[PDB]
Swiss-Prot record, chain A:
The gene is Uqcrfs1. Component of the ubiquinol-cytochrome c oxidoreductase (cytochrome b-c1 complex, complex III, CIII). UQCRFS1 undergoes proteolytic processing once it is incorporated in the complex III dimer. One of the fragments, called subunit 9, corresponds to its mitochondrial targeting sequence (MTS). The proteolytic processing is necessary for the correct insertion of UQCRFS1 in the complex III dimer, but the persistence of UQCRFS1-derived fragments may prevent newly imported UQCRFS1 to be processed and assembled into complex III and is detrimental for the complex III structure and function. It comes from the Eukaryota. Component of the ubiquinol-cytochrome c oxidoreductase (cytochrome b-c1 complex, complex III, CIII). Subunit 9 corresponds to the mitochondrial targeting sequence (MTS) of Rieske protein UQCRFS1. It is retained after processing and incorporated inside complex III, where it remains bound to the complex and localizes between the 2 core subunits UQCRC1/QCR1 and UQCRC2/QCR2. It comes from Mus musculus (Mouse). This is Cytochrome b-c1 complex subunit 9.
Swiss-Prot record, chain E:
The gene is Mt-Cyb. This is Cytochrome b. It comes from the Eukaryota. Heme 1 (or BL or b562) is low-potential and absorbs at about 562 nm, and heme 2 (or BH or b566) is high-potential and absorbs at about 566 nm. The chain holds residues 328 to 380 of 381 of the full protein. Component of the ubiquinol-cytochrome c reductase complex (complex III or cytochrome b-c1 complex) that is part of the mitochondrial respiratory chain. The b-c1 complex mediates electron transfer from ubiquinol to cytochrome c. Contributes to the generation of a proton gradient across the mitochondrial membrane that is then used for ATP synthesis.
Curated annotation (Swiss-Prot), chain G:
This is Cytochrome b-c1 complex subunit 1, mitochondrial. Belongs to the peptidase M16 family. UQCRC1/QCR1 subfamily. One of its GO terms (molecular function) is ubiquitin protein ligase binding. The modification Phosphothreonine is found at residue 180. The lineage of its organism: Eukaryota, Metazoa, Chordata, Craniata, Vertebrata. It comes from Mus musculus.
UniProtKB/Swiss-Prot annotation, chain H:
The keyword Transmembrane helix does not apply. The modification N6-acetyllysine is found at residues 38, 89. This is Cytochrome b-c1 complex subunit 2, mitochondrial. One of its GO terms (molecular function) is metalloendopeptidase activity. It comes from Mus musculus. It is found in: Mitochondrion inner membrane. The chain holds residues 162 to 453 of 453 of the full protein. It is a peripheral membrane protein. GO terms for cellular component: mitochondrial inner membrane; mitochondrion; myelin sheath; nucleoplasm; respiratory chain complex III. Component of the ubiquinol-cytochrome c oxidoreductase, a multisubunit transmembrane complex that is part of the mitochondrial electron transport chain which drives oxidative phosphorylation. The gene is Uqcrc2. Component of the ubiquinol-cytochrome c oxidoreductase (cytochrome b-c1 complex, complex III, CIII), a multisubunit enzyme composed of 11 subunits. The complex is composed of 3 respiratory subunits cytochrome b, cytochrome c1 and Rieske protein UQCRFS1, 2 core protein subunits UQCRC1/QCR1 and UQCRC2/QCR2, and 6 low-molecular weight protein subunits UQCRH/QCR6, UQCRB/QCR7, UQCRQ/QCR8, UQCR10/QCR9, UQCR11/QCR10 and subunit 9, the cleavage product of Rieske protein UQCRFS1.
Length: 78, 55, 101, 420, 53, 57, 446, 292
């Protein structure tokens, strides 16, 4: 009893993934289609850390604080 | 507040065809003859009107 | 032969796209096969091509040419679009041959 | 009459299997030990894009030629990817066979892997991952495999979201050059003659003869993952380390999962002959779905329970199933239950090879792992040689080992691994 | 070709006598030969001398 | 878990354990869903004649 | 090393006997250790009199919940004592109960089949239990949009006839039916001469015939009122149902025309036409180079999510058409392309696509009959619809003379200048009116 | 939430709090992905009416007389339920979550349970955190006085940053090591920091170094109250914590009233305790909890 799809009864098409490169004659049960997925918002480019001198202070030591202002930008205190 | 030039129902036609239409930078004077042809046609019709409405 | 090569180099110099810094493959008319030849290019050849076209348009706008030291000589005008264009032409030809029968 | 399945071990390590059903259409599979087991964190998701590149250009056959030829002959080309091994499959009517095999062999032999083509279908791998992750059992199973194993088997079947757009042709070329070698390949033909595919494999399968890159040695860590999904249904898988493929303890674990319940046998049934289903039905009065999940590989296995329950009734379902497998592990079972489990396992194995594609998958995996195929009669007599004391020992091994939990849904009342 | 159209305007101005008939014949056949056949063959020669095909 | 009646050609295709042998959901009850109907309200009635062409009566 | 037609003739043909009851018993023997034995009954929602609209569905849900000799869950213990799977389905015209098992427990399978089909004990608490179960199940099935559009197309295609009514029925027919309605339905529609006992696999016909004589004898053999029930031809009418619901992410639209029926051979020709169009899904790894033109246009223009084509046949009727799910902004454009493809099949059907569709249909007919269960299902519905099991060699023989001019003649007979039935669900606000679809059903100058 | 998750340290510490606590402290500051689109005004009204009670508020003012505060306090706030909901006592969980996002740098936070606020050992944990390194003091410096940074600088030859992370809460707390390092060099950095803390745990330290850590802690505490924002923040935190204002001189002499035996005890408590790990980056060489 090798070929673990034949060994695992209910979880046979979950442990294995089937992809078709050329569509066969028989149409498959449970075709399925994606819905309109939500898109993440656009942000700036992150500041890179390429030297040890600019990496100092970037490790957190105290718990998180989130500040939201009215006419003040939202700040994160590490 | 909205931009008048891009939301007007009559002026977006005239700016999309005349104002913010992207054209090549290196165009020489020869293409200008095409524009001349248009206004030449116009003055012909104007003279043609003056060749009929009094005559 | 040798004289044919000499007249070929003279015709290349008298064509006039080396005065604007253009390479030979930049001057191809962008048909459909040429469009998916450009679409299959890597990023550096594509960026150099776009800069060469923009510099040629900038020089044509002022009716000027590059100095003679900056002209594209015959040895460095390599054929970078040639394999992409020839395989695009080959696959279009075999698609047409399949659709013919 | 259908003759015996006949084998051939080539001197370059190629495995050859063929049977002549005299069928109206034949199927040809190529089985490679090139799953997602053989990756590291540097080239994750290589197996997904290599799985979807089954209809790309090859040296000698373009994408247009492959697609138009296979669709004109009416054949079907597909690929089944397990975590351990990959299987390319073609099927088609008699008057075409060899050219179809030629296309499949091109897909294995020389894919040049053009950069613009993989740049085209990385969006297709995003779409395929979304379609496959539309349901929750797949998400639970990949999260369980990520948590249970630390290396070499925690890699999912699908490309992760951070890599989408970061697979180049170099990684695919390295994967083909290091894992698609003839010593890990089995060519299997159901419904086509042995000599034809043997001379085809003689004339065309001469690219790489080494053993390739191997020696991953997947290790186990255990742990727990909880995913606040927000739906009413709660999915919970609790597994532990179990014996690999290649032991009698694997047969004992399969007998144990058929004794504890290995899926529905009845259209809209109640699963009276399952101990876990009986325990939860004694406990609760709401719909549920409790089964025993076993997934054994060539190096290690994961065996445990998988429950689907409500939001407010997850804890009693989990505790009832764990108390039932604890009662199994104390030896409290009858020999009639063991005989029923053996009968269910034998019937499931015999019905798994009913179709041609399942039988081809079975004999391809037997050609990979063992090198030769043994008939189902000795498989049934191997199943019948499993003692119930071995089942009690397997359940005792399951309950006394450290655990891997994967839970998703509204997890307010779902117990932790420490609470069990 | 442009100078050939200039010659054709000059010929169309002048009346029908010798040798304006044969200048008209030669100008018309040169016009049709330049537009029809001479320019694509010239383009083929240009493309052949550019190592294109 | 092996075959389910589907595929728009009236055929026994292949489905999953929770798809073929459990066509019901795992929901507790019928929730406050949008309602259903399959009934055309056209009230169309067809009356057939089905007469005899002979007998001369 | 045999060819195609020399390999189709090597298939063991089925063999059929007819009892004194009218019970038609058919078997096919292969070289497998397993078998699939089932009972196919000609009793669906077409026969319901708009007062017991879910009676067969309720009986199918109540068939496995207990019989007279094996009352209760101990019943399924016996069929789990041998590891035998059992399945059932109920269509608008068929009702099938089948068991997959080994070849060494065949008498138990035939005995349980007889006990299911003629001795079903209907308890009173099981009525309300299965009522709640089928309410949950019809809500779950209506949570999937494809079956909803399927039943909308049947409701708007055969309106005013007993074929448009759904298998499960409405909520009132769920709530108000009792044991007397199910008793009357099982007395009237579960008669002896409307049953096929079909076996496929490692079984022989003599033992199956002896088991059918022992267990399945004397089912009804009676009409009880001297009033023979029959079937009337249900008319197909052109209409359009639009279930506008704009909060759904995707839109499903199914457009169909009237199919010929089961007994008309040109269905085969129409299947080749469907094999020209085929089906597409968003997970298909073909790319741009797909052979079918509609799917290639759908990939190239980023129109579709998925689409299928169907040729459904009932007793002298049917529905032949296409069903697509896509976003709203694509919908009408795709309808144009869909209609264009049909007009190609009436005007410009070449010879290469006919050969490709014939090869696809050959692979479709042979590839489906793998194992025992689809072979047994084909045996059952062939003996129930055709009156005989059509062999695969006869299927190839019927496929063989299909060429381009008869294909375009048949497609012009069925697709050209017809009033279709349109069903839609979701954001179908760009789905065109019936005038645009009817105008797209023909061309101005052919 | 996207702007707050532009930084990666937020994701590390929220995954760490999700690991460490069973309930009532694993809830993130920011909304989960499934929660967006299903928060109604009934939940906000319930949250206000059963959490904004009058006995859970501190009205603080700078530059304003007390009579105006009395007038505002009785004229707006004097109608409430009174206590609201209690809580869920913040049970400790332990474990590890490792995520693979393919960044150039690897983050790893390894903590254990510590003393809560108001305990006598919270000051010992703060002194231990400043002894092991609690941020730089010189722009573009080397941080030689921090033991963890010097141990990793003795170890590695690549850019990094190692600090000690402490967090004091009402009924529980966390203390551990935060390391940001390279991909293949994460294991050496993590092991070097853990062996440094382990060598601290059996008492390998000097009293001058403890005095320097105390001076750093006192200077940071006095610099935290320079601005009016931080001063009002700590006054409100003390008024909600114990309900009594405590002058900074008593806090300074409370800081000086800890010994190095308590620091050794806190290090031993962190070493012998159950661990909670949150990791991100290319984790092909990052170790596990049983590998430490």
């Amino acid at each position: 009893m090798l070929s673990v799809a034949a060994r695992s009864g209910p979880f046979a098409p979950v442990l294995s993934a089937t992809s078709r490169g050329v569509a066969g004659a028989l149409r498959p049960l449970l075709q399925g289609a994606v819905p309109a997925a939500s898109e993440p918002p656009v942000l700036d480019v992150k500041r890179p850390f390429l030297c040890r001198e600019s990496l100092s202070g970037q490790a957190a030591a105290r718990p998180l604080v989130a500040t939201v202002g009215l006419n003040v930008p939202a700040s994160v205190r590490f | 507040m909205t931009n008048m030039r891009k939301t007007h129902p009559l002026f977006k036609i005239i700016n999309h065809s005349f104002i913010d239409l992207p054209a090549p930078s290196n165009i020489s004077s020869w293409w200008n003859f095409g524009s001349l042809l248009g206004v030449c046609l116009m003055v012909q019709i104007i003279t043609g009107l003056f060749l009929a409405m009094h005559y | 032969s040798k004289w044919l090569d000499g007249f070929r180099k003279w015709y290349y110099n008298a064509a006039g796209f080396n005065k604007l810094g253009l390479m030979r493959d930049d001057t191809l008319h962008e048909t459909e096969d040429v469009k998916e030849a450009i679409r299959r290019l890597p990023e550096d050849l594509y960026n150099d091509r776009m800069f060469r076209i923009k510099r040629a348009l900038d020089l044509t706008m002022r009716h000027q040419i590059l100095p003679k030291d900056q002209w594209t000589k015959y040895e460095e005008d390599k054929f970078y679009l040639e394999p992409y264009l020839k395989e695009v032409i080959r696959e279009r030809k075999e698609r047409e041959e399949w659709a013919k029968k | 009459q259908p003759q015996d399945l006949e084998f051939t071990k080539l001197p370059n390590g190629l495995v050859i299997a063929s049977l002549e059903n005299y069928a109206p259409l034949s199927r040809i599979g190529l089985f490679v030990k090139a799953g997602s087991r053989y990756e590291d964190s540097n080239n994750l998701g290589t197996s997904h894009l290599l799985r979807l590149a089954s209809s790309l250009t090859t040296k000698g056959a373009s994408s247009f030629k492959i697609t138009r030829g296979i669709e004109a002959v009416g054949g079907k080309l597909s690929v089944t990817a397990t975590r351990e091994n990959m299987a390319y499959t073609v099927e088609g009517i008699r008057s075409d066979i060899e050219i179809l095999m030629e296309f499949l062999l091109n897909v294995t032999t020389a894919p040049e892997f053009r950069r613009w083509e993989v740049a085209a279908l990385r969006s297709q791998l995003k779409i395929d991952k979304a379609v496959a992750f539309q349901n929750s059992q797949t998400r639970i199973i990949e999260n369980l495999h990520d948590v249970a194993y630390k290396n070499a088997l925690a890699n999912p079947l699908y490309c992760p979201d951070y890599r989408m757009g970061k697979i180049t042709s170099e990684e695919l070329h390295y994967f083909v050059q290091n894992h698609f070698t003839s010593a890990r390949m089995a060519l299997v033909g159901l419904g086509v003659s042995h000599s034809v595919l043997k001379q085809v494999a003689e004339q065309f399968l001469n690219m790489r003869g080494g053993l390739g890159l191997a020696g991953a040695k997947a290790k186990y860590r255990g742990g727990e993952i909880r995913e606040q999904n927000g739906d009413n249904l709660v999915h919970a898988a609790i597994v532990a380390e179990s014996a690999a493929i290649g032991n009698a303890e694997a047969n004992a674990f399969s007998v144990l999962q058929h004794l504890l319940g290995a899926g529905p046998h009845i259209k809209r049934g109640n699963n009276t002959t399952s101990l876990l289903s009986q325990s939860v039905a004694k406990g609760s009065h709401q719909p549920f779905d409790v089964s025993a999940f076993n997934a054994s590989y060539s190096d290690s296995g994961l065996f445990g329970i998988y429950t689907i329950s409500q939001a407010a009734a997850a804890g009693e379902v989990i505790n009832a199933a764990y108390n039932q497998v604890k009662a199994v592990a104390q030896g409290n079972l009858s020999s009639a239950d063991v005989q029923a489990a053996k009968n269910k396992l034998k019937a499931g194995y015999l019905m798994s090879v009913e179709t041609s594609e399942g039988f081809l998958s079975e004999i391809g995996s037997q050609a990979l792992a063992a090198g030769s195929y043994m008939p189902p009669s000795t498989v049934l007599q191997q199943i019948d040689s499993v003692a119930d004391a071995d089942v009690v020992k397997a359940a005792k091994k399951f309950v006394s080992g450290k655990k891997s939990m994967a839970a998703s849904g509204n997890l307010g009342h779902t117990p932790f691994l420490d609470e069990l | 070709l442009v100078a050939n159209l200039l010659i054709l305007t000059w010929i169309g101005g002048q009346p029908v006598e010798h040798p304006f008939i044969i200048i008209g014949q030669l100008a018309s056949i040169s016009y049709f030969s330049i537009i029809l056949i001479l320019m694509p063959i010239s383009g083929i020669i240009e493309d052949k001398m550019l190592k294109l095909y | 878990m092996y075959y389910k009646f589907s595929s728009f050609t009236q055929k026994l295709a292949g489905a999953w354990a929770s798809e073929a042998y459990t066509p019901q959901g795992l929901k507790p009850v019928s929730t406050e869903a949008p309602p259903i109907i399959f009934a055309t309200p056209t009230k169309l009635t067809s009356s057939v004649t089905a007469y005899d062409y002979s007998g001369k009566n | 090393t045999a060819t195609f037609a020399q390999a189709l003739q090597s298939v063991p043909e089925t063999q059929v006997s007819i009892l004194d009851n009218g019970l038609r018993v058919a078997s096919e023997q292969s070289s497998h250790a397993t078998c699939t034995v089932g009972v196919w009954i000609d009793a669906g929602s077409r026969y319901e009199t708009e007062k017991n609209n879910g009676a067969g569905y309720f009986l199918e849900h109540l068939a496995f919940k207990g019989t007279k000799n094996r009352p209760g869950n101990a019943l399924e213990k016996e069929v789990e004592s041998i590891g035998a799977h059992l399945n059932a389905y109920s269509t608008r015209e068929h009702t099938a109960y089948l068991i997959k098992a080994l070849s060494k427990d065949l008498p138990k399978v035939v005995e349980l089949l007889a006990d299911i089909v003629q001795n079903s004990s209907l308890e009173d608490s099981q009525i309300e239990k299965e009522r709640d179960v089928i309410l949950r199940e019809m809500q779950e099935n209506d949570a999937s949009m494809q079956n909803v559009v399927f039943d909308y197309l049947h409701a708007t295609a055969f309106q005013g006839t007993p074929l448009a009514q759904a298998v499960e029925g409405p909520s009132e027919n769920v709530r108000r039916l009792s044991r007397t309605d199910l008793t009357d339905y099982l007395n009237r529609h579960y008669k002896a001469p409307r049953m096929v006992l079909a076996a496929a696999g490692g079984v022989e016909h003599q033992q199956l015939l002896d088991l059918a004589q022992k267990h399945l004898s004397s089912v009804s053999r009676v009409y009880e009122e001297d009033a023979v029930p029959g079937l009337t031809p249900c008319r197909f009418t052109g209409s359009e149902i639009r279930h506008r619901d704009d909060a759904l992410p995707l839109a499903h639209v199914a457009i169909a025309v009237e199919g010929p029926g089961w007994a008309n051979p040109d269905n085969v020709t129409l299947q080749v036409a469907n094999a020209i169009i085929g089906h597409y899904d968003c997970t298909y790894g073909g790319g741009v180079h797909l052979s079918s033109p509609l799917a290639s246009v759908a990939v190239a223009n980023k129109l579709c999510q998925s689409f299928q084509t169907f040729n459904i046949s009932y007793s002298d009727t049917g529905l032949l058409g296409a069903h697509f799910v896509c976003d709203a902004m694509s919908i009408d454009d795709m309808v144009f392309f869909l209609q264009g493809q049909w007009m190609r099949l009436c005007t410009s059907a070449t010879e290469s696509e006919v050969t490709r569709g014939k090869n696809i249909l050959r692979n479709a007919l042979v590839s489906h009959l793998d194992g025992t269960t689809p072979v047994c299902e084909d045996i059952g519905r062939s003996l129930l619809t055709y009156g005989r099991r059509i062999p695969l060699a006869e299927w190839e023989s019927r496929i063989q003379e299909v060429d381009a001019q008869m294909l375009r003649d048949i497609c012009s007979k069925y697709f050209y200048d017809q009033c279709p039935a349109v069903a839609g669900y979701g954001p179908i606000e760009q789905l065109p009116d019936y005038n645009r679809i009817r105008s797209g059903m023909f061309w101005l100058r052919f």
